[PDB]
Amino acid sequence: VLYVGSKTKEGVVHDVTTVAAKTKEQVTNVGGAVVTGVTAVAQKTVEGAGSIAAATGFVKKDQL
Amino acid sequence: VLYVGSKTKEGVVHDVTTVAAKTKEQVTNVGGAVVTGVTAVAQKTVEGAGSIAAATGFVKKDQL
Amino acid sequence: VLYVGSKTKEGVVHDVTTVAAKTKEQVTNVGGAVVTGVTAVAQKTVEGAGSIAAATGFVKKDQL
C-alpha cells in the first residue's frame, strides 16, 4: 500500500536555466512598460472578475 | 498496491533552457509594451469574467 | 497492482531549449505591443466569459 496518496506537482516552475551574455541596451521608455529579465510565476488558483494574473509588460488605460 | 494514487504534474513548466548571446537593443517605447526576456507562467486554475491570465506584452485601452 | 492510479502530465511545458545568438534590434514602439523572448505558459483550466488566457503581444482597444 505504498503511495496510496498523491505525489504531485501542481502549478510548478522548476529547472529554468538562462545564460544571457550581453544586452547593450539603450532602453528609452516614455509612459510605457518594458520587461527585460527572467520572470517565473507559479500559481495554483486565481479568482474574481476583472482580475489579472501573471501580467508582464502591461499597459492598462481605460476611458471608463 | 504501489502507486494506487496519483503521481502527476498539472500546470508545470520545467527544463526550460535559454542561451541568448547578445541583443544590442535600442528599444524606444512611447506608451506601449515591450517584452524581451524569458517568461515562464505555470497555473492550475484561473476563473472569473473579464479575467486575463498570463498576459505578456499587453496594451488595454477601452473606450467603455 | 502497480500504477493502478494515474501517472500523467496535464498542461505541461518541458524540455524547451532556445539558442539565439544575436538580435541587433532597433525596436521602436508607439502605443503598441512587441514581444521578443521565450514565453512558456502551462495552464490546466481557465474559465469565465470574455476571459483571455495566455495572451502574448496583445492590443485591445474597444469602442464599447
Curated annotation (Swiss-Prot), chains A, B, C:
PTM comment: the record says: Phosphorylated, predominantly on serine residues. Phosphorylation by CK1 appears to occur on residues distinct from the residue phosphorylated by other kinases.
The main location is cytoplasm
Question: Keyword DNA-binding on this protein?
Answer: no
One GO cellular component this record assigns the protein to is: cytosol
Which tissues show it? Highly expressed in presynaptic terminals in the central nervous system. Expressed principally in brain.
Residues annotated for Cu cation binding in this entry: H14
What GO biological process terms are annotated to this protein in UniProt? Answer: adult locomotory behavior; amyloid fibril formation; behavioral response to cocaine; cellular response to copper ion; cellular response to epinephrine stimulus; cellular response to fibroblast growth factor stimulus; cellular response to oxidative stress; chemical synaptic transmission
Q: Where are the sequence repeats?
A: 6-20, 21-31
Q: Which UniProt keywords apply?
A: Acetylation, Alzheimer disease, Amyloid, Cell projection, Copper, Cytoplasm, Disease variant, Membrane, Metal-binding, Neurodegeneration, Nucleus, Parkinson disease, Parkinsonism, Phosphoprotein, Repeat, Secreted, Synapse, Ubl conjugation
The residue stretches assigned to a coiled coil in this entry are none
Q: Name one GO molecular function term.
A: identical protein binding
Residues annotated as carrying Phosphoserine in the record are S51
Q: Which domain of life is it from?
A: Eukaryota
Record region (4 X 11 AA tandem repeats of [EGS]-K-T-K-[EQ]-[GQ]-V-X(4)): 1-31
Annotated compartments: Cytoplasm; Membrane; Nucleus; Synapse
User: Subunit structure, per the record?
Assistant: Soluble monomer. Homotetramer. A dynamic intracellular population of tetramers and monomers coexists normally and the tetramer plays an essential role in maintaining homeostasis. Interacts with UCHL1. Interacts with phospholipase D and histones. Interacts (via N-terminus) with synphilin-1/SNCAIP; this interaction promotes formation of SNCA inclusions in the cytoplasm. Interacts with CALM1. Interacts with STXBP1; this interaction controls SNCA self-replicating aggregation. Interacts with SNARE components VAMP2 and SNAP25; these interactions allows SNARE complex assembly and integrity.
Name the family.
Belongs to the synuclein family.
Q: What does this protein do?
A: Neuronal protein that plays several roles in synaptic activity such as regulation of synaptic vesicle trafficking and subsequent neurotransmitter release. Participates as a monomer in synaptic vesicle exocytosis by enhancing vesicle priming, fusion and dilation of exocytotic fusion pores. Mechanistically, acts by increasing local Ca(2+) release from microdomains which is essential for the enhancement of ATP-induced exocytosis.
Entry domain remark: The 'non A-beta component of Alzheimer disease amyloid plaque' domain (NAC domain) is involved in fibrils formation. The middle hydrophobic region forms the core of the filaments. The C-terminus may regulate aggregation and determine the diameter of the filaments.
Give the disease entry from the UniProt record.
Answer: Genetic alterations of SNCA resulting in aberrant polymerization into fibrils, are associated with several neurodegenerative diseases (synucleinopathies). SNCA fibrillar aggregates represent the major non A-beta component of Alzheimer disease amyloid plaque, and a major component of Lewy body inclusions. They are also found within Lewy body (LB)-like intraneuronal inclusions, glial inclusions and axonal spheroids in neurodegeneration with brain iron accumulation type 1.
Supply the name of the protein. Alpha-synuclein
Species annotation: Homo sapiens (Human)
The shown range, given as first to last of full length, is 37 to 100 of 140
